Design a protein around this ligand. Structure first.
Ligand SMILES: Nc1ncnc2c1ncn2[C@@H]1O[C@H](CSCC[C@H](N)C(=O)O)[C@@H](O)[C@H]1O
Ligand SMILES: Nc1ncnc2c1ncn2[C@@H]1O[C@H](CSCC[C@H](N)C(=O)O)[C@@H](O)[C@H]1O
Ligand SMILES: Cn1c(=O)c2c([nH]c(=O)n2C)n(C)c1=O
Ligand SMILES: Cn1c(=O)c2c([nH]c(=O)n2C)n(C)c1=O
Lengths: 350, 347
C-alpha cells in the first residue's frame, strides 16, 4: 500500500515538481508558523547546544520542501546573530515513501547549499506511520499535505459508485474513514512521541474541511469529480465498474474538532496553536476555462496518477484526466469550492 | 568531477549493482576488520549510550553497502544481550547522480538515511559519528591532478593515467593531488567523528611502490590502449585521449601512512594489504570469463569516460577492452591489491 503511494516521479514535465503552485501557497500561508516555532526552540535554550535536528515529512519531488529548509536556516541564522554565537549547526531529514523519486529532489537539493549556520540535508525513505528516527533525535518536525494520506484504505463490500465519502455513500463509509484517520494519525503521533525531544515542537499542515459532514462539495470535490470521470468511462465500457465500486482512495480530510480530539486523547504533545483557513482552490487569474482547468488538472493528476493508475492501469490514465479536465471547464465553468487547510502546531509534553 | 562522477546508475544489466562480483570479495576480507572495530566501540563503553551513528561514504547503487550495515547491526545484536534497548543510525553517503532510487529500491532498531554529497567536504554535524566506513571510494580525487597543464599542450600524451610512456612529473602530480584530497577527507572527518571514535576505510593501491607498474595500473592501461586503438580508427578525437587524465589514484602502503601521519587527528590501529584475483579464472572460457571482468569495469568507468568521449562510441570501446583482455593477455591479469586501514580520532 505504501509500496505504490507517491507523486509523479521526475522530472519535471507535467510531474509533481512543475505542478506545485497551489501547495507552495499553503506553505506561504503557514510560513510564519514555522518561523515562530523556530523561535520557540531558541527560547528553549536547551536546543542551542550543540546541533539542532529538524525534519520534513513527506517532501515528494516538488519545490516546496526546501522552501521550509530555507526559512529554518534563515530564521536560525538570524537568532544566531542576536546570540552572537557562531556554533549553530542544522541537520535536516527529508522523508518520503520509498517509491518517491529522490534523484529529482536530490538534484533540486543539490543546487541549494551552495554563512553563519551550516546545513546538512539527509534523505529518509519509508513510512512516517512507524518510527523513522532514533529516540529524542528531533527538536523540530514539519509536515505539509502528507498526514492525511492513510496507512491503508478504510476497513462483496461496496462504496458504490465512489472512490471516497460522498452524499451517495451511507453510512460506515463516513465512519470508517473517521476511525481510520484516528488509527493512522495515532501511529504517526505515537511514533513521533519517542522521536521528538521533550518540549520539542511540531508543525503539521494537512488538507481538511470546515463542514461537519465531509460529503459537502467543498470537502470532497476532488474525489467526487474523479469518481465521475472514471464512472463515465465505464459507461463507455473502457473500465469495469466493479473495480470502481471496490476502489476507495486511502486518504482523508477531517474537521478541526476531529483533529483536536485526535491529538487530545494521545497526550504526547499539547496543542500550541491550531487554525483552519480556506484558499481559493485554484488561480483563477485566467479567463479561459480551459486554462484554469488544465492548470488544475495537471496539478491534480500530479498527486493522484500513481495511486489511481495502480487500480485502473497506466494506459487509460490519459483519457480519464482529459475527461476530468473537461467536466471542470465545461460542466463546472472552471469554478470550484474553496480548499480548507489546517495549521497544526504541537509541543511534546514529556 | 564531483558533479559528473557516479557509478553506472540503473538495475541491470551494466549497472554496478549487478556488477558487485569483485567488491563483495573485498568486503569479506575486511569483514573481520569491520567486526573488530564495531566491537571496540562497545569497548569504548561510552558508545553504549545511547545510539550509535554509522556512515558509509561511497555506497554507489550496489548491494555491497548493505553488506557493511548488516554486520554492524548483527554484531551489535550479540553485544547488547551480554551487556543487557539500543539504536543504530546508518548514513548512506555518495555523490549526486547516484541512483539513490536504485539504492533505496534495493534497501527495503536500525534507521538508515541517505546523505548526498562529497566526503571531501562537511557532511555531518560536529561530534556526531562513532563509526565510519568506506570501501573503494576514497581513492577517487575531486579533479584531474594539478600539474598536467599546460605548460602554456602537454602532458600525459597519450594516456589517461600514470604509465611508463610518460614524464616523471605525473607520478609526482598524482601523488600531489591525492595528498591534497585525502587530507580534506581526513580534515573534514576529523571534526565529525566523536573523540576516540573509529574509522575503517578500504581502497586499492599498489604493492610495487612504483605507480607505473603494470600490476598497479593495468585497469587504466588496458583502457588507455582500448581508447587509443579506437582513436587510430578515427572513431574518437586524438587530442582528447592525450589531455584527459583520470581522477583516481592508487597509493602505496607507505604513502598512505604519511598522509595519515601528517594530519595528526587520526591514529592507525591497524593497516594491511591483500591481493585478490582480478577475475575468476574458475571459468574455462577466456572469452566468456573476461567479459565479466569487462562488465564490472564498465560498471564504474562508463560515466567518467562517456563524459569526455561521449556515450555514442562507448559500446565499441569496451568491445575492444574485452578483446584486449581475452586475446592479448589470454584472460590473465595481475592481482588487484586492496588496502584495509583502521583509524581512531587522536582526541
Ligand atoms: N505514510 C507516508 N510516509 C511517508 N511519506 C508519505 C506517506 N504518505 C504520503 N507521503 C508523502 O507525502 C508527500 C505529499 S506531497 C508533499 C507536499 C509538499 N508539496 C512538499 O513537498 O513537502 C508525497 O510525496 C507522499 O509520498
Ligand atoms: N569524492 C567523492 N565523494 C563522495 N562519493 C564519492 C566520491 N568519489 C567517488 N564516490 C562514490 O563512491 C562510490 C564507490 S562504489 C561510487 O558510487 C562513487 O559515486
Ligand atoms: C489532497 N491533496 C491536495 O489536494 C493537493 C496536494 N497538492 C496540491 O497542490 N493539492 C491541491 N496533495 C499533495 C494532496 O494530498
Ligand atoms: C577503481 N575501482 C575499481 O577498480 C573497482 C571498483 N569496484 C571493483 O569491483 N573494481 C575492480 N571501484 C569502485 C573502483 O573505484
Amino acid at each position: 500500500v505504501k509500496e505504490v503511494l507517491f507523486m509523479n516521479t521526475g522530472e519535471g514535465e507535467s510531474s509533481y515538481v512543475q505542478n506545485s503552485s497551489f501547495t507552495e501557497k499553503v506553505a506561504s500561508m503557514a510560513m510564519p508558523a514555522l518561523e515562530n516555532a523556530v523561535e520557540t526552540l531558541f527560547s528553549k535554550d536547551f536546543h542551542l547546544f550543540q546541533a539542532i535536528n529538524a525534519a520534513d515529512l513527506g517532501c515528494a519531488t516538488g519545490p516546496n520542501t526546501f522552501a521550509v529548509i530555507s526559512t529554518i536556516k534563515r530564521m536560525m541564522e538570524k537568532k544566531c546573530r542576536e546570540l552572537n554565537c557562531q556554533t549553530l549547526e542544522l541537520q535536516v531529514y527529508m522523508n518520503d515513501l520509498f517509491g518517491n523519486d529522490f534523484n529529482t529532489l536530490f538534484k533540486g537539493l543539490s543546487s541549494k547549499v551552495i554563512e553563519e549556520v551550516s546545513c546538512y540535508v539527509m534523505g529518509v525513505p519509508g513510512s512516517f506511520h512507524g518510527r523513522l528516527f532514533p529516540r529524542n533525535s528531533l527538536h523540530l518536525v514539519h509536515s505539509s499535505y502528507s498526514v492525511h494520506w492513510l496507512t491503508q484504505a478504510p476497513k462483496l463490500a461496496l462504496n458504490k459508485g465512489r472512490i471516497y465519502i460522498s452524499k451517495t455513500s451511507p453510512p460506515v463509509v463516513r465512519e470508517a474513514y473517521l476511525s481510520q484517520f484516528h488509527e493512522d494519525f495515532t501511529m504517526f503521533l505515537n511514533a513521533r512521541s519517542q522521536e521528538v525531544v521533550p518540549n520539542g515542537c511540531m508543525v503539521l499542515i494537512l488538507r481538511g474541511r470546515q463542514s461537519s459532514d465531509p460529503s459537502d462539495m467543498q470537502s470532497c470535490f476532488i474525489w467526487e469529480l474523479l469518481a465521475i470521470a472514471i464512472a463515465e468511462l465505464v459507461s463507455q465500457g473502457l473500465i469495469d465498474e466493479d473495480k470502481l465500486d471496490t476502489f476507495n482512495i486511502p486518504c482523508y480530510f477531517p474537521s478541526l474538532e476531529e483533529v483536536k480530539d485526535i491529538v487530545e486523547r494521545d497526550g504526547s504533545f499539547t496543542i500550541d496553536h491550531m487554525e483552519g483557513f480556506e484558499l481559493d482552490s485554484l488561480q483563477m487569474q485566467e479567463n479561459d476555462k480551459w486554462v484554469r482547468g488544465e492548470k488544475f488538472a495537471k496539478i491534480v493528476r500530479a498527486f493522484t496518477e500513481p495511486i489511481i493508475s495502480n487500480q485502473f492501469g497506466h494506459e487509460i490514465m490519459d483519457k480519464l484526466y482529459d475527461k476530468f479536465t473537461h467536466i471542470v471547464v465545461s460542466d463546472l465553468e472552471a469554478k470550484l469550492p474553496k480548499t480548507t487547510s489546517i495549521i497544526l502546531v504541537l509541543s511534546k509534553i514529556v
